[PDB]
């Protein structure tokens, strides 16, 4: 699917009570995201871990 | 412990708005009516157009059915002790039986009392639903006899449309004037017409002429009235203490049993066709206009410390409307003063573009706006 980071989310519709971005936006200096549980940098083909 | 403040109905000021009669055969009666007959007066015109005869007319108004009720549940362990079945021979079971019977008495005391506050509430529920607002009523009694052609009706509705939106709140938007309040109250007390005459009322002041009506309000309005604009007349009044009666016997009986009807004043019709206690109760009167009315606030004597809402806090209903994205025509966009809300120097002026949102105030005053993207719930649907 479309990656959330590339396509900007919204101006107002970010703060709607439904989207899944507030769940990971809770500090003005850090970022949070889901990622494969591997070590970086890893092999070429992204595993399904 | 705590007592129980008993209340009777005939002592209230509200009793003068209704004639109460016991009719122990009401559970048998099918639809009952009352017959009027009125005869309008007439005046003599002249000239060519022919005269007119004097008109008569009859009419009937039928009754309607209401009822009250109140549950009375009593328990298990106690119904064992009341009837003596579960009673044991001790010096301790007897005391518990005494307790249970005191409970039953203290219960029936409250249950039987409720049938007074019941009528005290029922009267307000009835009167409140048959009374038109004053605003929609004052001009209507000003165009009487004229509502035949369309033009008079048109002027009437064009005046209603203003009255309803100009005089629908006094003593909150007018707390500086005193005589406007009094004029509105006089208008309210005089817009109504007297009803039929019955000698069983005799509701009288301690000295002289009888009373005419009630004025039920909330405690707040009564307090704001009884200190700036209205003066008390007295503090006691003579009221009747006995109900009315209506029974079927010895002439209505045969008719209701063989034919199927029974007039009320049957004995009088018969003997014409063939040859043949004032109590002293502490209420609050007042004089307004040229009439004498009771001035009550029943929020404390009744309705207090229970779970029903006082039926005199009404509910007004207005439907607002506002245009969202209309773009004014060309010749109507213009600044009233050349020094406008001038924007920051160097940036384009966003005051010329077609608007796309409206701003208005919330219940308290916080601003809450509505914009197009709130219309997705409507303009995005197959129904479109």
């Amino acid at each position: 699917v479309r990656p959330r980071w590339a396509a900007p989310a919204a101006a107002d519709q970010l703060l709607a009570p439904g989207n899944a971005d507030l769940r990971l936006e809770l500090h003005p200096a850090f970022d949070f995201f889901v990622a494969p549980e591997v070590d970086v940098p890893g092999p070429f083909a992204v595993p399904q871990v | 412990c705590s007592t129980l403040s008993l209340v009777r109905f005939l002592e209230l000021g509200l009793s003068v708005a209704c004639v109460c009669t016991k009719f122990p055969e009401l559970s048998y009666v099918a639809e009952g009516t009352i017959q009027f007959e009125v005869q309008q007066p007439m005046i003599a015109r002249d000239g060519p157009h022919p005269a007119d005869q004097p008109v008569h007319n009859y009419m009937i108004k039928r009754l309607d059915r209401r009822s009250l009720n109140a549950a009375f549940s009593i328990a298990v362990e106690a119904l064992g002790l009341i009837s003596g079945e579960n009673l044991d021979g001790t010096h301790i079971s007897s005391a518990m039986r005494l307790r249970a019977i005191q409970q039953l008495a203290r219960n029936v005391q409250a249950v039987l009392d409720s049938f007074e506050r019941g009528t005290a509430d029922q009267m307000l529920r009835v009167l409140m639903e048959k009374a038109p607002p004053l605003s929609l009523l004052a001009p209507f009694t000003l165009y009487e006899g004229r509502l035949a052609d369309r033009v008079a009706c048109a002027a009437l509705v064009s005046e209603l449309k203003r009255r309803v939106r100009d005089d629908t709140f006094f003593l909150t938007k007018h707390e500086r004037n005193k005589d406007a309040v009094l004029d509105r109250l006089s208008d309210l007390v005089n817009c109504t017409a007297p009803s039929v005459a019955v000698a069983r009322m005799t509701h009288a002041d301690t000295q002289g002429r009888p009373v005419d009506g009630v004025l039920v309000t909330t405690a707040g309005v009564r307090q704001r009235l009884l200190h700036h604009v209205l003066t008390l007349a007295d503090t006691h009044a003579d009221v009747p203490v006995t109900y009315g009666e209506m029974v079927i016997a010895n002439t209505n009986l045969v008719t209701a049993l063989v034919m199927g009807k029974a007039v009320s004043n049957m004995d009088d019709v018969a003997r014409y066709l063939l040859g043949g206690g004032s109590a002293r109760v502490r209420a609050d009167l007042v004089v307004v206009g040229d009439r004498l009315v009771f001035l009550e606030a029943l929020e404390k004597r009744v309705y207090q410390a229970t779970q029903v809402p006082y039926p005199l806090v009404g509910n007004l209903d207005v439907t607002f409307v506002m245009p969202l994205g209309v773009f004014k025509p060309a010749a109507d966009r213009y600044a009233r003063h050349a020094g406008s809300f001038a924007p920051t120097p160097g940036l384009p002026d966003p005051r010329t573009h077609p608007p796309r949102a409206v701003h208005f105030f919330n219940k308290d005053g916080v601003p809450c706006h509505v914009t197009f993207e709130h219309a997705m719930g409507t303009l995005c649907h197959p129904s479109f």
């Binding site: - | 048998y28 099918a30 009516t33 009027f36 199927g260 009320s264």
Partner: protein, 48 residues
């Protein structure tokens, strides 16, 4: 609706369902229907 005081008695018994023609309205309930014991009148209270 049914009578209260009979005026006079009938002298000879006869089967009635056979002679239905002589009458205008006819009603033969089995025994003790419900409509008999309903005393429900209707009556005007006041005239003015």
């Amino acid at each position: 609706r049914p009578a209260i005081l009979p005026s006079g008695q009938i002298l000879s018994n006869i089967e009635v369902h056979s002679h239905r023609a002589l009458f205008d309205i006819f009603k033969r309930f089995r025994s003790d229907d419900n409509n008999l014991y309903g005393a429900e009148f209707d009556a005007l209270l006041g005239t003015y």
